[PDB]
Write a protein that binds this ligand. Structure first.
Ligand SMILES: *[C@@H]1O[C@H](CO)[C@@H](O[C@@H]2O[C@H](CO)[C@@H](O)[C@H](O)[C@H]2NC(C)=O)[C@H](O)[C@H]1NC(C)=O
Ligand SMILES: *[C@@H]1O[C@H](CO)[C@@H](O[C@@H]2O[C@H](CO)[C@@H](O)[C@H](O)[C@H]2NC(C)=O)[C@H](O)[C@H]1NC(C)=O
Ligand SMILES: *[C@@H]1O[C@H](CO)[C@@H](O)[C@H](O)[C@H]1NC(C)=O
Ligand SMILES: *[C@@H]1O[C@H](CO)[C@@H](O)[C@H](O)[C@H]1NC(C)=O
Ligand SMILES: *[C@@H]1O[C@H](CO)[C@@H](O)[C@H](O)[C@H]1NC(C)=O
Ligand SMILES: *[C@@H]1O[C@H](CO)[C@@H](O)[C@H](O)[C@H]1NC(C)=O
Ligand SMILES: *[C@@H]1O[C@H](CO)[C@@H](O)[C@H](O)[C@H]1NC(C)=O
Ligand SMILES: *[C@@H]1O[C@H](CO)[C@@H](O)[C@H](O)[C@H]1NC(C)=O
Ligand SMILES: *[C@@H]1O[C@H](CO)[C@@H](O)[C@H](O)[C@H]1NC(C)=O
Ligand SMILES: *[C@@H]1O[C@H](CO)[C@@H](O)[C@H](O)[C@H]1NC(C)=O
Ligand SMILES: [Zn+2]
Lengths: 897, 96
């Protein structure tokens, strides 16, 4: 009944909260029913802004103690007189506690509501929840929180929308021998509980005005390491005592303060709090969460062993720390009005993470990785017709499933990509200047995307920056409509044309656009290696002699891929570009060498160039040593693997990659003094790993000897691991694939007795590389036993099994038979996306259409859009294998000789 | 001449592992503070557990290893508590 307010998903405008006090008490031992529980109480003070005879507040999985026959007590403020409560009810679909009143509240009068409640402290990584670990033979239980997006309501009743900002007075009641942590510092030292001195009471300073999704409460036996930042903020890194004593927090300590100070100076906006805690939880869903003053991490995003974690693990830590600290401005100080503008939080933090990580590790040149890790990662999905705009109409985002669906590559990686492009056309100094104004103006308030254009417009006006039109009109093209253009260059005439790039030209684009899928595009270009003047494309088609060539001249568009567009050239320019790559590839910038590879493979898939042109662009890689062009190639050819690794085409494909990678493999064997050293440059270290992994995947026998001998050497001396962490992931998987039950059993025990999570992660993925099907079935049964694989790792491990060609059918059959049970008990989106990406036949399509029909009434929640994208990709794959199988088979045979 | 240097970390739950040790026991083997300085082989007996060790630096002294109180016109070489690869705390001084 949508006529009733409590059956609608958005809160009424009638009540606004002002402040809360919440007291929570986790019981870290099971009760007689076997449950871990927390007991709690709250008072919210709120103002009536419009007269109403109902209070609607959020409540999820909370059981209420009855006071005076009702779930709440309602009190007046300043002499206001509340009506009697007629009835209270819980409405589960919309997650409401509804308090029905015998009369209306009074406009502008304040009121206070008291509640007393209980909840499960579940192993579900949501709300107020339990995380577990072993300390010797003793299992420790931690109470910890995850509120974003809509789970604060699961710890205490609140007006759980991000624009319902308020201040919070937190009290935690905890065992006397455990520390309690929250957003703020304690108001004073922890006192015994009068009723039972085995418990203590800790009360925390009032928070700033804040969104409910940023609250955090933690009770643990954790120790910590401490350092005071250059801006006076106290930084602590919290983890399991054994991890802190070993030093696994020391790298996070070294970087957290400096990065926070860097962002404060960069944006001319102080971090407004006395301390920022960073805490690593054994059980944690999303990697990290930006709670104001109490940032929570997955262990593999915070802890780091310098002798056993890899350079990619180190890059992960500093990147996630920089990402969460970015949210302290973009997300905590200034917050989205509603979840449909999520990119204002996550796109900014995905862009700004590279500035902070570059500051702490300037020798890594991480900013260049944004093209592979963000631009090309998201253009894969944004080329579908089942994509969505950066900013989605707010009327369309209502349910928690719809909200969770937006924590996706569009909000993160495309948000980051347009900010990369937006911070390139106008100066970064000009950019940061407009963002400082924005942060100052909306501090402790909420924003929509139109507020961002205004403050950037002030910065361009004040900096005398010339633009083809307003910041507003340029960036709405990239924000209010989905997708991106392909820019097609005719270099005989210098003509540019743009159109909406789609993976399948027969896809049905049904979402309308008020710009009819035309963009305003900043064009950078180089000629023969020299950068030309900038150009702005304003029409669908235009001419400038910047794009005209004669003779031996070649031009490229999108230097270093700062723009969010793909480029196609005429037949002559392509052939000159390919000639340049053969003669001297160094004349083309390293990022644009990856652009040439990645665009051609995507253009070919869209029937805009011949697939043999895309493949010919990979011929020079036999003499390529840089990480990035190889990684763009291996990434684009992972589609070819997915389409062909069950078919006769796979042999020749592996034959080609063997021929292309073998010189680079021999080079690294030499350059590393037989794998005894690792390169100094970070990109060179990643190139080495890609060369080894590609060599072993495609059957270079020197690699297969190398990895199995190392792993045999490890098994003979288990306490002295002879494999450098950079190679562990590739060495472990290939040794397991080549090995038997003994290699698998050894790595399984090493996973169970692991003390570093960075090490368990490598073993957990590698165990899915078994070629025995009975082993993969046993491993799949393990992934759903929480005593064996943590619930936070179940999907991640199932996906590693589906990436195994032997596991593909096992997991797809598992998904089809157990969907109802699984769903009623975990990223359904990522599982659907991974289990279906091999689909290239009408038979796989009818299973998918039937999988939809069979489960339409349970629904798919936040997997709903991944299902539609799987349907669109599968249809395109059927056509693509039809049109390309023989051409690709023959090309690989001819060029692997 | 023997210089004993020991320290313990803060105890119980919720401790700062890298902060200055809560307990320090610097003992010069036959020194009495009111009797003044102690005037053959210098010895060092520093703590060593996990990543924490005790050291003695050279300070101003032109030599490298007598009072725990200032010796006017002398050189004070600091006694340190070091956490391998992270923090170093001056926990004492040996004046000469
Ligand atoms: C949360 O705590 C704050 C601070 O302890 C409370 O703010 C005080 O509230 C009273 C009554 O409104 C005022 O007279 C004081 O001046 C306030 N202090 C400050 C510093 O502003 C707030 O009322 C508490 N909220 C709840 C719901 O308990
Ligand atoms: C394009 O990106 C490359 C980095 O991949 C930039 O080349 C670097 O430029 C800086 C400054 O000139 C040098 O210190 C680096 O050593 C160069 N690295 C490489 C790989 O050559 C280049 O400057 C960028 N071009 C523009 C104009 O953005
Ligand atoms: C809350 O009440 C429901 C309904 O009786 C019950 O199933 C659930 O176990 C209760 N929660 C706790 C933590 O006991
Ligand atoms: C608990 O309270 C007691 C008594 O005030 C105090 O000695 C102790 O430090 C407190 N413990 C914690 C974890 O705060
Ligand atoms: C932390 O920084 C100090 C000083 O640069 C350094 O000695 C130490 O090795 C660093 N630790 C880690 C884990 O990077
Ligand atoms: C632009 O200039 C005006 C006047 O100097 C100033 O008030 C405003 O804050 C400036 N905006 C930015 C973003 O610099
Ligand atoms: C790929 O290279 C071969 C070898 O020269 C050439 O014949 C073919 O035309 C190329 N394909 C395209 C379309 O570039
Ligand atoms: C590395 O290559 C050089 C030149 O080919 C050769 O002299 C050297 O022995 C090689 N080292 C090894 C064992 O890879
Ligand atoms: C201080 O050190 C000396 C020598 O090691 C020892 O005899 C004495 O008991 C220590 N004092 C304390 C309080 O432990
Ligand atoms: C230290 O010397 C003073 C005399 O200066 C004496 O009174 C005191 O007992 C001495 N301490 C010891 C333990 O010898
Ligand atoms: Zn984020």
């Amino acid at each position: 009944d949508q006529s009733k307010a409590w059956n609608r998903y958005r809160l009424p405008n009638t009540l606004k909260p002002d402040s809360y006090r919440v007291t929570l008490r986790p019981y870290l031992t099971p009760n007689d029913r076997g449950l871990y529980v927390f007991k709690g109480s709250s008072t919210v003070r709120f103002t009536c802004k419009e007269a109403t005879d109902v209070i609607i507040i959020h409540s999820k999985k909370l059981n209420y103690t009855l006071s005076q026959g009702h779930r709440v007590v309602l009190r007046g403020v300043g002499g206001s007189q509340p009506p009697d409560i007629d009835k209270t009810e819980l409405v589960e679909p919309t997650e409401y506690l509804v308090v029905h009143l015998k009369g209306s509240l009074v406009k502008d009068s304040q009121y206070e509501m008291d509640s007393e409640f209980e909840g499960e402290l579940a192993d579900d990584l949501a709300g107020f929840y339990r995380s577990e670990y072993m300390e010797g033979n003793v299992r420790k239980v931690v109470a910890t929180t995850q509120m974003q997006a809509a789970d604060a309501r699961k710890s205490f009743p609140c007006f759980d929308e991000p624009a319902m900002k308020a201040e919070f007075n937190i009290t935690l009641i905890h065992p006397k021998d455990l520390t309690a942590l929250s957003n703020m510092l304690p108001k004073g030292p922890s006192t015994p509980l009068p009723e039972d001195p085995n418990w203590n009471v800790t009360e925390f300073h009032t928070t700033p005005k804040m969104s409910t999704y940023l609250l955090a409460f933690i009770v643990s036996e954790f120790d910590y390491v401490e350092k005071q930042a250059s801006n006076g903020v106290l930084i602590r890194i919290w983890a399991r005592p054994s991890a802190i004593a070993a030093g696994h927090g020391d790298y996070a300590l070294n970087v957290t303060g400096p990065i926070l100070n860097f962002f404060a100076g960069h944006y001319d906006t102080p971090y407004p709090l006395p301390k920022s805690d960073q805490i690593g939880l054994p059980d944690f869903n999303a990697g990290a969460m930006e709670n104001w003053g109490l940032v929570t991490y997955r262990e593999n995003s915070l802890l780091f062993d310098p002798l056993s974690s890899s350079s990619s693990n180190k890059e992960r830590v500093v990147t996630v720390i920089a990402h969460e600290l970015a949210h302290q401005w973009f997300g905590n100080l200034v917050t989205i009005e509603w979840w449909n503008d999520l990119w204002l939080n996550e796109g900014f933090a995905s862009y700004v993470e590279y500035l902070g990580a570059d500051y702490a590790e300037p020798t890594w040149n991480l900013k260049d990785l944004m093209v592979l890790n963000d631009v090309y990662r998201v253009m894969a999905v944004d080329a579908l017709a089942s994509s969505h705009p950066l900013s989605t109409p707010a009327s369309e985002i209502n349910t928690p499933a719809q909200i969770s669906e937006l924590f996706d590559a569009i909000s993160y990686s495309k948000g980051a990509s347009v900010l990369r492009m937006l911070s390139s056309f106008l100066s970064e100094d000009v950019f940061k200047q407009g963002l400082a104004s924005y942060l100052h103006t909306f501090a402790y308030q909420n924003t929509i995307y139109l507020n961002l254009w205004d403050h950037l417009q002030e910065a361009v006006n004040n900096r005398s920056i010339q633009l083809p039109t307003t910041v507003r009109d340029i960036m709405n093209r990239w924000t209010l409509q989905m997708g991106f253009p392909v820019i097609t260059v005719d270099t005989s005439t210098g003509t540019l044309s743009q159109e909406h790039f789609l993976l399948d030209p027969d896809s049905n684009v049904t979402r309308p656009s008020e710009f009819n899928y035309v963009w305003i595009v900043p064009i950078t270009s180089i000629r023969d290696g020299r950068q030309q003047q900038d150009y702005w494309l304003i029409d669908v088609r235009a001419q400038n002699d910047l794009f005209s060539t004669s003779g031996n001249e070649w031009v490229l568009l999108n230097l270093n891929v700062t723009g969010y567009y793909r480029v196609n050239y005429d037949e002559e320019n392509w052939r000159k570009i390919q000639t340049q790559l053969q003669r001297d590839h160094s004349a083309i910038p390293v990022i644009n060498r990856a652009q040439i590879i990645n665009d051609a493979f995507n253009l070919a898939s869209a029937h805009k160039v011949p697939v043999t042109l895309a493949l010919n662009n990979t011929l020079f890689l036999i003499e390529e040593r840089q990480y990035m062009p190889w990684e763009a190639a291996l990434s684009s050819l992972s589609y070819f693997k997915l389409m062909f690794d069950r078919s006769e085409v796979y042999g020749p494909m592996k034959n080609y990659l063997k021929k292309q990678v073998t010189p680079l493999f021999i080079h690294f064997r030499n350059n590393t003094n037989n794998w005894r050293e690792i390169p100094e440059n970070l990109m060179d270290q990643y190139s080495e790993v890609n060369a080894i992994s590609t060599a072993c995947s495609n059957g270079v026998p020197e690699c297969e000897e190398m990895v199995s001998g190392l792993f045999k050497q490890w098994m003979e001396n288990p306490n002295n691991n002879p494999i450098h962490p950079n190679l562990r992931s590739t060495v472990y998987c290939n040794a397991i694939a080549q090995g038997g039950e003994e290699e698998w059993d050894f790595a399984w025990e090493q996973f169970r007795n692991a003390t570093l999570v960075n090490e368990a992660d490598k073993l957990r993925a590698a165990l899915a590389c078994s070629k025995e099907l009975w082993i993969l079935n046993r491993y799949l049964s393990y992934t759903l036993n929480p005593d064996l694989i943590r619930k936070q790792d179940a999907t991640s491990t199932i996906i590693s099994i589906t990436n195994n060609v032997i596991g593909q059918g096992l997991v797809w059959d598992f998904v089809q038979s157990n969907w109802k049970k699984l769903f009623n008990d975990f990223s359904f989106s990522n599982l659907i996306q991974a289990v279906t990406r091999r689909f290239s036949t009408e038979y796989e399509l009818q299973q998918l259409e039937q999988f939809k029909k069979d489960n339409e009434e349970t629904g798919f929640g936040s997997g709903t859009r991944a299902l539609e994208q799987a349907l669109e990709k599968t249809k395109a794959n059927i056509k693509w294998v039809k049109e390309n199988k023989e051409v690709v088979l023959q090309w690989f045979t001819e060029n692997s000789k | 001449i023997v210089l004993y240097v020991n320290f313990k970390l803060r105890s119980g739950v919720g401790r700062c592992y890298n902060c200055r040790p809560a307990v320090v026991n610097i003992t010069l083997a036959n020194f009495n503070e009111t009797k003044g300085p102690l005037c053959f082989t210098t010895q060092f007996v520093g703590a060593k557990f996990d990543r924490w060790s005790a050291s003695i630096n050279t300070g101003n002294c032109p030599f490298s290893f007598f009072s725990l109180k200032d010796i006017p016109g002398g050189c004070a070489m600091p006694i340190m508590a070091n956490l391998a690869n992270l923090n170093s705390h001056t926990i004492g001084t040996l004046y000469v």
